[PDB]
Design an enzyme around this catalytic site. Structure first.
Site, PDB file in Angstrom:
ATOM      1  N   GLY A  21       0.930  -1.126   0.034  1.00  0.00           N
ATOM      2  CA  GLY A  21       0.094   0.023  -0.039  1.00  0.00           C
ATOM      3  C   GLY A  21       0.836   1.172  -0.050  1.00  0.00           C
ATOM      4  CD  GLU A  22       3.555   3.229  -3.818  1.00  0.00           C
ATOM      5  OE1 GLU A  22       4.610   3.986  -3.708  1.00  0.00           O
ATOM      6  OE2 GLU A  22       3.006   3.039  -4.570  1.00  0.00           O
ATOM      7  N   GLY A  23       0.764   5.975   0.285  1.00  0.00           N
ATOM      8  CA  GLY A  23      -0.158   6.964   0.587  1.00  0.00           C
ATOM      9  C   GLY A  23       0.848   8.020   0.625  1.00  0.00           C
ATOM     10  CG  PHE A  25       1.369  11.457   5.698  1.00  0.00           C
ATOM     11  CD1 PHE A  25       2.053  12.650   5.483  1.00  0.00           C
ATOM     12  CD2 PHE A  25      -0.094  11.445   5.477  1.00  0.00           C
ATOM     13  CE1 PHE A  25       1.164  13.865   5.559  1.00  0.00           C
ATOM     14  CE2 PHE A  25      -0.726  12.840   5.604  1.00  0.00           C
ATOM     15  CZ  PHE A  25      -0.198  14.025   5.442  1.00  0.00           C
ATOM     16  CB  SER A  27       5.037   3.000   1.014  1.00  0.00           C
ATOM     17  OG  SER A  27       6.373   2.589   1.166  1.00  0.00           O
ATOM     18  CB  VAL A  28       2.762  -1.057   4.196  1.00  0.00           C
ATOM     19  CG1 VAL A  28       2.851  -2.580   4.722  1.00  0.00           C
ATOM     20  CG2 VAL A  28       2.405   0.066   5.191  1.00  0.00           C
ATOM     21  CE  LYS A  42       4.291 -12.586   3.949  1.00  0.00           C
ATOM     22  NZ  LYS A  42       5.324 -12.342   2.475  1.00  0.00           N
ATOM     23  CG  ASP A 143      -4.356   7.600  11.988  1.00  0.00           C
ATOM     24  OD1 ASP A 143      -5.710   7.620  11.775  1.00  0.00           O
ATOM     25  OD2 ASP A 143      -3.425   7.321  11.026  1.00  0.00           O
ATOM     26  NE  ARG A 147      -7.618   5.368   8.039  1.00  0.00           N
ATOM     27  CZ  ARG A 147      -8.601   6.162   8.570  1.00  0.00           C
ATOM     28  NH1 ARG A 147      -9.849   5.673   8.325  1.00  0.00           N
ATOM     29  NH2 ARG A 147      -8.537   7.064   9.237  1.00  0.00           N
ATOM     30  CG  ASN A 148      -4.689   3.201  10.787  1.00  0.00           C
ATOM     31  OD1 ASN A 148      -4.214   2.877   9.798  1.00  0.00           O
ATOM     32  ND2 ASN A 148      -5.241   4.267  10.987  1.00  0.00           N
ATOM     33  CG  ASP A 161      -0.834   3.965  11.088  1.00  0.00           C
ATOM     34  OD1 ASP A 161       0.322   4.535  11.044  1.00  0.00           O
ATOM     35  OD2 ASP A 161      -1.745   4.696  10.071  1.00  0.00           O
TER      36      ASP A 161
HETATM   37  C1  LIG Z   1      -2.484  -6.019   1.638  1.00  0.00           C
HETATM   38  N1  LIG Z   1      -1.789  -6.466   2.993  1.00  0.00           N
HETATM   39  C2  LIG Z   1      -1.036  -5.801   3.865  1.00  0.00           C
HETATM   40  C3  LIG Z   1      -0.715  -6.598   5.032  1.00  0.00           C
HETATM   41  C4  LIG Z   1       0.113  -6.293   6.017  1.00  0.00           C
HETATM   42  C5  LIG Z   1       0.723  -7.200   6.815  1.00  0.00           C
HETATM   43  N2  LIG Z   1       1.294  -7.156   7.940  1.00  0.00           N
HETATM   44  C6  LIG Z   1       1.350  -5.753   8.273  1.00  0.00           C
HETATM   45  N3  LIG Z   1       1.953  -5.589   9.652  1.00  0.00           N
HETATM   46  C7  LIG Z   1       0.853  -4.666   7.652  1.00  0.00           C
HETATM   47  C8  LIG Z   1       0.869  -3.426   8.133  1.00  0.00           C
HETATM   48  O1  LIG Z   1       2.020  -2.997   8.932  1.00  0.00           O
HETATM   49  N4  LIG Z   1       0.008  -2.271   7.865  1.00  0.00           N
HETATM   50  C9  LIG Z   1      -0.021  -1.178   8.461  1.00  0.00           C
HETATM   51  C10 LIG Z   1      -0.851  -0.101   7.581  1.00  0.00           C
HETATM   52  C11 LIG Z   1      -1.749   0.661   8.522  1.00  0.00           C
HETATM   53  C12 LIG Z   1      -1.918  -0.444   9.709  1.00  0.00           C
HETATM   54  C13 LIG Z   1      -0.755  -1.100   9.822  1.00  0.00           C
HETATM   55  O2  LIG Z   1       0.108  -0.404  10.751  1.00  0.00           O
HETATM   56  C14 LIG Z   1       1.354  -1.000  11.264  1.00  0.00           C
HETATM   57  C15 LIG Z   1       2.270   0.064  11.863  1.00  0.00           C
HETATM   58  C16 LIG Z   1       2.707   0.004  13.170  1.00  0.00           C
HETATM   59  C17 LIG Z   1       3.468   0.981  13.795  1.00  0.00           C
HETATM   60  C18 LIG Z   1       3.851   1.944  13.176  1.00  0.00           C
HETATM   61  C19 LIG Z   1       4.961   3.015  13.659  1.00  0.00           C
HETATM   62  C20 LIG Z   1       4.925   4.227  13.064  1.00  0.00           C
HETATM   63  C21 LIG Z   1       6.111   4.802  13.651  1.00  0.00           C
HETATM   64  C22 LIG Z   1       6.604   4.567  14.920  1.00  0.00           C
HETATM   65  C23 LIG Z   1       7.651   5.765  15.533  1.00  0.00           C
HETATM   66  C24 LIG Z   1       7.982   5.163  16.775  1.00  0.00           C
HETATM   67  C25 LIG Z   1       8.852   5.780  14.585  1.00  0.00           C
HETATM   68  N5  LIG Z   1       6.984   6.973  15.458  1.00  0.00           N
HETATM   69  C26 LIG Z   1       7.975   8.178  15.571  1.00  0.00           C
HETATM   70  C27 LIG Z   1       7.061   9.735  15.353  1.00  0.00           C
HETATM   71  N6  LIG Z   1       6.217   9.612  16.505  1.00  0.00           N
HETATM   72  C28 LIG Z   1       5.513  11.249  16.239  1.00  0.00           C
HETATM   73  C29 LIG Z   1       4.100  11.093  17.104  1.00  0.00           C
HETATM   74  O3  LIG Z   1       3.367  12.107  16.821  1.00  0.00           O
HETATM   75  C30 LIG Z   1       5.086   8.539  16.284  1.00  0.00           C
HETATM   76  C31 LIG Z   1       5.797   7.229  16.206  1.00  0.00           C
HETATM   77  C32 LIG Z   1       6.353   3.539  15.479  1.00  0.00           C
HETATM   78  C33 LIG Z   1       5.589   2.626  14.877  1.00  0.00           C
HETATM   79  C34 LIG Z   1       3.471   2.107  11.684  1.00  0.00           C
HETATM   80  C35 LIG Z   1       2.757   1.191  11.167  1.00  0.00           C
HETATM   81  C36 LIG Z   1       0.370  -5.039   6.351  1.00  0.00           C
HETATM   82  C37 LIG Z   1      -1.242  -7.783   4.353  1.00  0.00           C
HETATM   83  N7  LIG Z   1      -2.146  -7.891   3.242  1.00  0.00           N
END
Ligand code: A1APF
Ligand code: CL
Ligand code: CL
Length: 282
Positions: A21-23, A25, A27-28, A42, A143, A147-148, A161
């Site tokens: 996925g891409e947005g 802010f 991508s995943v 994996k 957030d 979807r999250n 997320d």
């Molecule tokens: C089609 N398909 C897809 C799959 C798929 C399979 N398996 C997965 N795990 C995912 C998958 O990961 N999908 C993500 C998309 C949305 C929901 C899910 O989210 C996961 C996720 C968790 C944690 C983070 C995070 C982001 C910043 C941080 C720090 C600490 C760096 N940041 C620093 C900056 N601070 C500022 C605050 O204001 C915030 C925290 C720490 C964690 C970010 C994202 C997708 C299967 N099929």
């Protein structure tokens, strides 16, 4: 990058794969992480389209804190890889993907079968358990939406997320906040863009409504630009078809005008667990 909490993973140990996925802010991506015994793992890789050494060091301290989350309904960060430094968070791969897309697929003959009422309530209990855990550690999610939330291979939902997540009182690292979807934002957070644990409770109520409608966009017939005025006039999400009256009263309690009138995640979680216990088996 000093990294005193040892959260950084060597970039060479990670092999990037297909984009899931891409947005605007970030991508995943699908990926493989070479483990100590030579066997690959994996994983999912979340990139962010941002920088400074202090910003990355602050980012790693936040990552180190999230790496210590230990709850079945909260995704556990594996580490951070860095690439001007470009940070990427490494996560376990959640087979079934996000809950929102899963609900939509369930309305297709080829997707998951028709989700029973009891299973929809169980998804809500799972999210409330995860939010209760984060809320007890003084975290603001900021957030929360279907979807999250992710589905593990055993169909337990976990909150994910954490891109805008922060401890209460901590510095606001970021812009990225101002572009968040208006239909999940509490009325007091639209007027001042300030969030509390009660703003997450509001978003939780919206997420329960998404689960009960099997993925409908909140407020059909209402445009994003009219949302603040709509909520200011006392209007709220309508009761979905076949949503128990008891369940709807729990959702509506999340949208009380005064944040202090809304319940806590501990109270919501217990009210949902009690309602689920009172229903027959499927
Ligand atoms: C089609 N398909 C897809 C799959 C798929 C399979 N398996 C997965 N795990 C995912 C998958 O990961 N999908 C993500 C998309 C949305 C929901 C899910 O989210 C996961 C996720 C968790 C944690 C983070 C995070 C982001 C910043 C941080 C720090 C600490 C760096 N940041 C620093 C900056 N601070 C500022 C605050 O204001 C915030 C925290 C720490 C964690 C970010 C994202 C997708 C299967 N099929
Ligand atoms: Cl509605
Ligand atoms: Cl109604």
């Amino acid at each position: 990058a000093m990294d005193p909490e040892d959260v950084v993973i060597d970039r060479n140990l990670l092999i990037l794969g297909k984009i899931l996925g891409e947005g605007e802010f970030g991508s995943v991506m699908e990926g493989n992480l070479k483990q100590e015994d030579g066997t690959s793992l994996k994983v999912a890789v979340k990139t962010m389209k941002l920088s400074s050494q202090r910003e990355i060091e602050e980012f790693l301290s936040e990552a180190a804190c999230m790496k210590d989350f230990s709850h079945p309904n909260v995704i556990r960060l594996l580490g951070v890889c860095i690439e001007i430094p470009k940070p990427m968070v490494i996560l376990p791969f959640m087979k079934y993907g996000d809950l929102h897309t899963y609900l939509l697929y369930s309305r297709l003959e080829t997707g998951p079968k028709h989700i029973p009422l009891q299973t929809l309530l169980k998804f809500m209990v799972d999210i409330a358990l995860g939010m209760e855990y984060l809320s007890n550690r003084n975290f603001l999610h900021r957030d929360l939406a279907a979807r999250n939330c992710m589905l593990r291979d055993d169909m337990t939902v976990c909150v994910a997320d954490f891109g805008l997540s922060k401890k209460i009182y901590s510095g606001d690292y970021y812009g990225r906040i101002a572009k968040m979807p208006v239909k999940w934002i509490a009325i007091e957070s639209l007027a001042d863009r300030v969030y509390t644990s009660k703003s997450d409770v509001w978003a939780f109520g919206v997420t329960m409504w998404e689960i009960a409608t099997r993925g409908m966009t909140p407020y059909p017939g209402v445009q994003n630009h009219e949302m603040y005025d709509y909520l200011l006039h006392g209007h709220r999400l309508k009761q979905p078809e076949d949503c128990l009256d008891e369940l709807y009263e729990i959702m509506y309690s999340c949208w009380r005008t005064d944040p202090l009138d809304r319940p806590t995640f501990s109270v919501l979680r217990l009210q949902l667990e009690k309602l689920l216990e009172s229903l027959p088996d499927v």
